[PDB]
Design a protein around this nucleic acid. Structure first.
Ligand SMILES: [Zn+2]
Ligand SMILES: [Zn+2]
Ligand SMILES: [Zn+2]
Length: 85
DNA sequence: AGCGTGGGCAC
DNA sequence: TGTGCCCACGC
């Protein structure tokens, strides 16, 4: 863990430098990815893709047990466990 | 539930 | 560097 966050108040450390560059945006407040539907800005392209699904209703992830659909795989992952008991 | 959003990391 | 998942936490 060689790459430490330069911001004094921040004591985060990272493996690869590209991680520090992404992380540094939490301090600069930079959000280079905009949703052309609601005009909101996001820090990351992947979070914008999933955000947009809230507008379109696209839900590519279906539960293997009941078939319920989700916009994100983690929502599906969190849901699937309700079938156990 | 709905979903923002940082961290780890593959390609 | 850029793109894009998984993973996990938070409200
Ligand atoms: Zn920092
Ligand atoms: Zn939007
Ligand atoms: Zn289910």
């Amino acid at each position: 863990r060689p790459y430490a966050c330069p911001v004094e108040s921040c004591d985060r450390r990272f493996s690869r430098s590209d991680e520090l560059t992404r992380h540094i945006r939490i301090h600069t407040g930079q959000k280079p990815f905009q949703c052309r539907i609601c005009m909101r800005n996001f820090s990351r392209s992947d979070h914008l893709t999933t955000h947009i699904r809230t507008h379109t209703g696209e839900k590519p992830f279906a539960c293997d047990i009941c078939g319920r659909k989700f916009a994100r795989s983690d929502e599906r992952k969190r849901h699937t466990k309700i079938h156990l008991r």
